[PDB]
């Protein structure tokens, strides 16, 4: 698709067998969720925001579904406001911006 | 232009007759820049992100010029790790998302 911004660009994903809600974040790095259970062992990870530094908890090679395009990558967890898909999983799925 | 996201999409803007980078932000409600003079009246907001909220200076129908288009709207003003450049600049340039 392509997706304007006068609306944040929430996207349904697909994570664990369930959905969630997830913003198409370019101006992050990494991909972000709230709290949740995943399989495997995590490592730790600190990432910064505006406001500061979390800890987060960081899973490699998760499998997960974005707007119905598979990806299979990082995924952090952990006190984050929101869902966030960061550029690790855009780049998998073809993402660009256009102007 | 078309924008990978290999890496941060970083682009130059002028504002207030000066030169900066900033990075074009789809999970940015708003835009937000590192300390610097703006003209005319402001007012205080918070904003909130990964690390809780900071306070900045709120600066209305502000010039800007993105990657070389011209476009009006508010820009926060405080202490942001990085210039942001958020959704109600990037619709005014005709920015999408596309993949
Ligand atoms: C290199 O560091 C990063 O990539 N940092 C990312 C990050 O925080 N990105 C920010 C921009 C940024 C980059 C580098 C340093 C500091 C900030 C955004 O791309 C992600 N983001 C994701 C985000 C969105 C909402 C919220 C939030 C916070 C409080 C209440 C409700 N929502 C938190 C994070 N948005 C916001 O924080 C925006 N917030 C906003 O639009 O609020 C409606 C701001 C900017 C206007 C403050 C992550 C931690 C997610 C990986
Ligand atoms: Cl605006």
Redesign the interface.
């Known amino acids: 698709?392509?997706?304007?911004?006068?609306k944040?660009?929430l996207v349904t994903i697909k994570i664990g067998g369930q959905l969630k809600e997830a913003?198409?974040?370019?101006?992050?790095?990494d991909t972000?969720l709230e709290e949740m259970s995943l399989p495997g062992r995590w490592k730790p990870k600190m990432?910064?925001?505006?406001?500061?530094?979390?800890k987060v908890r960081q899973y490699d090679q998760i499998l997960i579904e974005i707007?119905g395009?598979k990806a299979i990558g990082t995924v952090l967890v952990g006190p984050?406001?929101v869902n966030?898909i960061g550029?690790n999983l855009?780049?998998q799925?073809?993402?660009?911006?256009?102007?």
């Open positions: 698709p392509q997706i304007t911004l006068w944040r660009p913003l198409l974040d370019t101006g992050a790095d972000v990432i910064g925001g505006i406001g500061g530094f979390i707007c395009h984050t406001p966030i550029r855009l780049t799925i073809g993402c660009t911006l256009n102007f």
